[PDB]
Design an enzyme around this catalytic site. Sequence first.
Site, PDB file in Angstrom:
ATOM      1  N   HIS A   1      -7.434  12.754 -11.140  1.00 48.55           N
ATOM      2  CA  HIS A   1      -7.547  11.462 -10.098  1.00 48.55           C
ATOM      3  C   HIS A   1      -7.168  11.910  -8.730  1.00 48.55           C
ATOM      4  CE1 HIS A   1      -6.490   7.124  -9.374  1.00 48.55           C
ATOM      5  NE2 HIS A   1      -6.443   7.840  -8.212  1.00 48.55           N
TER       6      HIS A   1
ATOM      7  N   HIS B   1      -7.522  12.025  -4.174  1.00 47.34           N
ATOM      8  CA  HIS B   1      -8.556  11.577  -2.965  1.00 47.34           C
ATOM      9  C   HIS B   1      -8.513  12.714  -1.843  1.00 47.34           C
ATOM     10  CE1 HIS B   1      -8.190   7.346  -4.084  1.00 47.34           C
ATOM     11  NE2 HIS B   1      -7.201   7.601  -4.809  1.00 47.34           N
TER      12      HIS B   1
ATOM     13  N   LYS C   1     -15.484   4.047 -10.679  1.00 52.35           N
ATOM     14  CA  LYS C   1     -14.228   3.712 -10.152  1.00 52.35           C
ATOM     15  C   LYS C   1     -14.298   1.985  -9.804  1.00 52.35           C
ATOM     16  CE  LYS C   1      -9.661   3.938  -9.358  1.00 52.35           C
ATOM     17  NZ  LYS C   1      -9.183   4.823  -8.252  1.00 52.35           N
TER      18      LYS C   1
ATOM     19  N   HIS D   1      -8.052   1.116 -11.519  1.00 55.41           N
ATOM     20  CA  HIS D   1      -6.882   0.792 -10.819  1.00 55.41           C
ATOM     21  C   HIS D   1      -6.714  -0.624 -11.364  1.00 55.41           C
ATOM     22  CE1 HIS D   1      -4.158   0.617  -7.181  1.00 55.41           C
ATOM     23  NE2 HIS D   1      -4.150  -0.475  -7.780  1.00 55.41           N
TER      24      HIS D   1
ATOM     25  N   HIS E   1      -3.397   5.980 -13.165  1.00 55.96           N
ATOM     26  CA  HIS E   1      -2.269   6.022 -12.598  1.00 55.96           C
ATOM     27  C   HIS E   1      -1.148   4.798 -13.000  1.00 55.96           C
ATOM     28  CE1 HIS E   1      -3.896   3.044  -9.881  1.00 55.96           C
ATOM     29  NE2 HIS E   1      -4.316   4.206  -9.039  1.00 55.96           N
TER      30      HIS E   1
ATOM     31  N   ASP F   1      -3.208  11.474  -8.225  1.00 59.46           N
ATOM     32  CA  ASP F   1      -3.342  10.573  -6.783  1.00 59.46           C
ATOM     33  C   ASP F   1      -2.867  10.931  -5.709  1.00 59.46           C
ATOM     34  OD1 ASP F   1      -4.842   7.996  -6.159  1.00 59.46           O
ATOM     35  OD2 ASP F   1      -2.801   6.790  -6.338  1.00 59.46           O
TER      36      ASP F   1
HETATM   37  N1  LIG Z   1      -2.585   4.883  -4.499  1.00 59.35           N
HETATM   38  C1  LIG Z   1      -2.322   4.836  -3.423  1.00 59.35           C
HETATM   39  O1  LIG Z   1      -1.304   4.537  -3.028  1.00 59.35           O
HETATM   40  N2  LIG Z   1      -3.343   5.150  -2.367  1.00 59.35           N
HETATM   41  C2  LIG Z   1      -4.721   5.698  -2.705  1.00 59.35           C
HETATM   42  C3  LIG Z   1      -5.489   4.510  -3.326  1.00 59.35           C
HETATM   43  C4  LIG Z   1      -5.206   4.089  -5.034  1.00 59.35           C
HETATM   44  O2  LIG Z   1      -5.123   5.079  -5.676  1.00 59.35           O
HETATM   45  O3  LIG Z   1      -5.276   2.787  -5.066  1.00 59.35           O
HETATM   46  C5  LIG Z   1      -5.301   5.752  -1.372  1.00 59.35           C
HETATM   47  O4  LIG Z   1      -6.408   6.210  -1.316  1.00 59.35           O
HETATM   48  O5  LIG Z   1      -4.624   5.900  -0.221  1.00 59.35           O
HETATM   49 ZN   LIG Z   2      -5.637   3.383  -7.745  1.00 60.57          ZN
HETATM   50 ZN   LIG Z   3      -6.266   6.893  -6.441  1.00 62.47          ZN
END
Ligand SMILES: NC(=O)N[C@@H](CC(=O)O)C(=O)O
Ligand SMILES: [Zn+2]
Ligand SMILES: [Zn+2]
Lengths: 336, 343
Positions: free
Chosen positions: A13, A15, A99, A129, A167, A240
């Site tokens: 997971h 970003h 997703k 999510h 998460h 995450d």
């Molecule tokens: N979780 C978060 O707090 N931030 C994630 C988004 C996500 O996993 O929802 C993001 O892309 O900024």
């Molecule tokens: Zn998320």
């Molecule tokens: Zn995420």
Amino acid sequence: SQVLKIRRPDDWHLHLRDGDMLKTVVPYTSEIYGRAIVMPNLAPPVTTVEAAVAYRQRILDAVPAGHDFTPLMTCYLTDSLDPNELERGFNEGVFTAAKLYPANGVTSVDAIMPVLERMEKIGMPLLVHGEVTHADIDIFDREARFIESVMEPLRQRLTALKVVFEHITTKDAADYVRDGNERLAATITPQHLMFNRNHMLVGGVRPHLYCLPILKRNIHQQALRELVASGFNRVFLGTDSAPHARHRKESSCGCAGCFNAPTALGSYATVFEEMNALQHFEAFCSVNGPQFYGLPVNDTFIELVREEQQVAESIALTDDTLVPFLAGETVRWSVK
Amino acid sequence: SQVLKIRRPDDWHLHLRDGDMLKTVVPYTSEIYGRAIVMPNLAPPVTTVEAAVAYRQRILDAVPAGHDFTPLMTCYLTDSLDPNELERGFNEGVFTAAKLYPANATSNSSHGVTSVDAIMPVLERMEKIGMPLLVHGEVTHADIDIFDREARFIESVMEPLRQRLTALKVVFEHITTKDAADYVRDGNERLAATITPQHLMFNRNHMLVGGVRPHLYCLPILKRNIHQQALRELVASGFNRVFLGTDSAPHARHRKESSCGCAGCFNAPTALGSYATVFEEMNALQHFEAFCSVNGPQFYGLPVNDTFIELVREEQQVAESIALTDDTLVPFLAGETVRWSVK
Ligand SMILES: NC(=O)N[C@@H](CC(=O)O)C(=O)O
Ligand SMILES: [Zn+2]
Ligand SMILES: [Zn+2]
Ligand SMILES: O=C1C[C@@H](C(=O)O)NC(=O)N1
Ligand SMILES: [Zn+2]
Ligand SMILES: [Zn+2]
């Protein structure tokens, strides 16, 4: 002194953002993890095979020579997505999963049934999510409410669908997952294992601990720690890692997300060690994910040493800085 | 457009800070409020009659020409505070009340209270002489969830204290829970409470949904909606031992919008109209004057103000920020269009 040798991990997971932020952040992942599930919530989101191929190449351009890192791409589900587009991407090896984000994403599961049915038929995992978003629902209740009103109905309708409850942050979700079947898994971040909402709110408000789903009560944190430490084999590493420039975090309306890629692995090691559960640590990092996704485990190994490393106060960006999770603090374990 | 004319209000819970910040913030209070309870949490705290006298004078110096404003000073309770010092301040008109912040075993004796049991001589003195105790009622033990700290205080400290000292007059400051609302509702004539505009207008969702909003971060922390609704119902009921206390608590923008944002809302500029909006929405405007201008005086045994002010139901925009000597202050509801304003 103490050394812990594990199979090289993956991050189920992640970003990575885009542009100059992507160039900055990918090496923190690529230097450690063999693969990572790259989330699709760009602006605009990755909803086509073509966009995913291009995104994948930008990521690869940013991977230092000598890092053997493979980004596994995902499709952002939308109410109107053509199931043929999702399937084509899957068949081509472009999309590893799709997703599902709540609306304020997808408005209803019912609107996207054809897509989910296609995923169920082709064996494509669904990453969720899991939060409801109605204005009247307290933010701390949104995960629990999701299980009852969306997750369990969905799984009852599509009994062959493979789902990762991303998460997870609550005892509710931990119990849900523990008691589920082999088509249900979860990821847990380091922050939801290491802290609870007190760490974000006592003595000051700490936006670098502010993420979604929001940090919960300690009883929830303890449930997550017990879950991973139990050896349960359908939970696995997903950071995450969600980076934002410093002044997007420290502002009158701070963005959600912890930039934990630089510190997550050692942070996890500390939790497992605390829970007297280092015998389950490799499986969490390097085995459970691959098993759920039906992908091979990595064939290289890394070493963690229990020597305290000091976390940078900030990481330079083209404009502004990036404040890492645990900035200025110490991590007990580091990569040899 | 509609007019609401009330006896001039007072603010029974206020932070004025010191130095340049005091100079900037005092006018927002003095233009409107006849009196205010000035809290003693300076660095270092106001713990002596002499310091309170000098602070009162610095406040008076910063009042614009023509404003009829009287600061009512408070003593910060500490382990080392001499009960004779507190009594002398009370007797001389210097200290209107004393303020008890959460206990902490690690507190320097010069700066705070290690446990309530340890300051019983001073609390007995206050009981004996009829000095009101103002309580920030939270327990701050590391193993208590922050949203639980007020309720735990009621059980652990407030109730036992009031049973121990049956004549002691207590104001439960800035209440934030249904627990505290019910407790105060069910209390006797020696127990009162203040409520801020943020705790009536908002709940924790406002601070955390869609973004983290440090300008809504204050102690005691915003609670879940069921608690906000209880507060609203309490004020709207006409219950006469709840009164206006803003907990206006200014911090520079850079200290709010940081990796560790300070707790406090700068609501002096917008509080009164916000309270009017809440009473209106609760169809309880018949109780609004009493809350602003009568209930506090009655509890403290002071006269009600004999001049009037008018609020008008005409829309105005709140400033985005207010200049300080260095940095800026972001007011409560900055940049928003508000419904009621002072004429
Ligand atoms: N979780 C978060 O707090 N931030 C994630 C988004 C996500 O996993 O929802 C993001 O892309 O900024
Ligand atoms: Zn998320
Ligand atoms: Zn995420
Ligand atoms: O108890 C307190 C203290 C106050 C301040 O900043 O002085 N701010 C708050 O938010 N509550
Ligand atoms: Zn207080
Ligand atoms: Zn206060």
